[PDB]
Design a binder for this molecule. Structure first.
Ligand SMILES: Nc1ncnc2c1ncn2[C@@H]1O[C@H](COP(=O)([O-])OC[C@@H](N)Cc2ccc(O)cc2)[C@@H](O)[C@H]1O
Ligand SMILES: Nc1ncnc2c1ncn2[C@@H]1O[C@H](COP(=O)([O-])OC[C@@H](N)Cc2ccc(O)cc2)[C@@H](O)[C@H]1O
Lengths: 305, 305
């Protein structure tokens, strides 16, 4: 099964409670990083399986900032720096989706991939109208009882109004896309369980409609941007890896079928000195983020050493 | 002293922690009532004393509804019915201010009286911008700890997001007028202690500036609108009054100096059958709300009976 393969690979951590699925990426920087990569893959796996996916840029929401999993209040971001980053991200996601569509074809009939931005619909949204329209459908108890929200709420200083209100936007986003694109599935890291929850409860209060969430593991400075992190630098992060991990990361960052992976490892023991599973993971990934060129301008770089 | 006379009269309940002072009136109906009258007098007393006052219509805030002192959630109001009422109120306050400026002159140099509406500045306010601009200055603990807010919060059903967010707007209003009109005093009934609090703390977080609040007693169906409640009907509310009260209501709803009042009462005992203090209170008030005509078309009405 589709979900089977992904839960099995270790990509689809959990789920609650032709389709359309989405995941958001807050443009709090101009570059995506290796962690973002994992959520994005989740989309790529659903896309290959034939589904339509939407990778959303948080032009609006990054002005505020996600409180989720954070113990400290963020440095409010200049409304313009966030506008820039949002345009960098869009570019970055169309870029990735680009490599993925040529360098990893499988003859399967694929689904669409679309980059949206929530600023598009927030720029037409006036405070009291929003509040008047929806505010009456968010029970305060509900919002107050997210586990995502305790680190900041229960903090010594407390949580700004903004931080708290953040979840409400994300909840609304899910509602919006669901309305306009019939999208009934949201996906993100585990840190996003709370927010997604708000979404499906909210949608459920309004329409008896059942939508869904899916999470993926969180992995534990590494940029998808050639400018920030060279294709070579990036290769090194995946090559300098412990053997106990290269197992999971293969199942994590690559499309190699599980059997192909299996062999790679069983083979690795007959040749531990080879760093073979790393030389594979590193290749697969750098191919996806930086294209064939990037792989080459990294293969080459190390080799001479 | 000015505050002395008002605290003494029983009009200036409390205060915390040429000037400009304001009080808001939510257009949840097209008519003001006798209770509103008290808060408005508070303004009139400050205005006679020479100060500039602003009677604010809550065009925006009445769409939500004030949670303060309420045990139950309000029936969400049609955004259009609220627009109509807001235009009725503006008319009603310019009307009262009218009678007050002819039928109650005292040769003193008076201060300005201005009717504003918050919808004016909320209609230009976009959700994320507001949240982005200010949301970070409202500690959630603060907002969560108003006594105004417990009846609804601690309720079995809980409080909508809207109800809770209400205080935030009122807090912002005070900040707005203070910015634009250097207004540094807000006044309302006692039920409004909480909200006003939010205002001066918020202003204080932003500017070390000290602004202030003043409250007035709450009195315990009676419309300032000739259409709803005839000038005669209204006279009867003030005439059908217990002697233990006519004392306070004179000090409450009239401008008669305290000595003049004193006599009226000491006189009343020599003639209890006269209902003299009531025939005075009733006259004073009906004169202010319905003008000389109204007094007459009420004096006349009863007399023939
Ligand atoms: N190191 C990592 N390892 C694994 N996963 C990671 C890692 N870092 C980030 N992620 C995941 O990838 C996404 C990154 O977006 P974000 O700006 O960090 O989350 C903010 C998001 N709430 C923005 C949003 C906006 C609008 C919306 O509708 C939905 C969501 C999120 O789904 C997040 O859970
Ligand atoms: N029976 C009564 N006796 C004495 N006083 C009474 C009585 N009834 C009402 N009041 C007072 O008169 C005013 C009426 O406003 P309101 O819509 O009832 O409260 C809502 C308010 N938040 C409106 C507002 C809107 C915007 C804003 O910025 C400030 C305020 C308030 O100051 C209220 O406390």
């Amino acid at each position: 099964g589709l979900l089977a393969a992904q839960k099995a690979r270790g990509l689809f951590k959990d789920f609650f409670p032709p389709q359309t699925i989405y995941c958001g990426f807050d443009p709090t920087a101009d570059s995506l990083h290796v962690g973002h990569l994992l959520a994005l893959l989740g989309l790529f796996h659903l896309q290959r399986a034939g589904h339509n996916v939407i990778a959303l840029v948080g032009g609006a929401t990054a002005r505020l900032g996600d409180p989720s999993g954070r113990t400290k209040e963020r440095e409010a971001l200049e409304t313009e720096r966030v506008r820039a980053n949002a345009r960098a991200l869009r570019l970055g996601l169309e870029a990735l989706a680009a490599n993925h569509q040529q360098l990893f074809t499988d003859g399967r009939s694929w689904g669409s991939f679309t980059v949206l931005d929530n600023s598009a619909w927030y720029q037409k949204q006036h405070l009291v109208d929003f509040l008047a329209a929806v505010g009456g459908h968010f029970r305060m108890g509900t919002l107050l009882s997210r586990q995502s929200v305790q680190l900041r709420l229960k903090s010594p200083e407390g949580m700004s109004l903004a931080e708290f209100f953040y979840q409400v936007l994300q909840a609304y986003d899910f509602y919006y896309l669901f309305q306009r694109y019939g999208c009934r599935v949201q996906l993100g890291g585990s840190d996003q369980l709370g927010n997604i929850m708000s979404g499906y409860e909210f949608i459920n209060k309004l329409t008896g409609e059942d939508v869904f969430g899916i999470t993926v593991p969180l992995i534990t400075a590494v940029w998808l941007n050639r400018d920030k992190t060279s294709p070579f630098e990036l290769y090194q992060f995946f090559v300098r890896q412990p053997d106990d991990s290269v197992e999971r990361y293969l199942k994590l960052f690559t499309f190699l079928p599980l059997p192909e992976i299996d062999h790679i490892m069983q083979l690795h023991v007959k040749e531990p000195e080879r760093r073979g599973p790393q030389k594979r993971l590193a290749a697969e990934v750098t191919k996806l983020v930086h294209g064939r060129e990037g792989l080459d301008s990294a293969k080459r770089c190390t080799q001479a050493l």
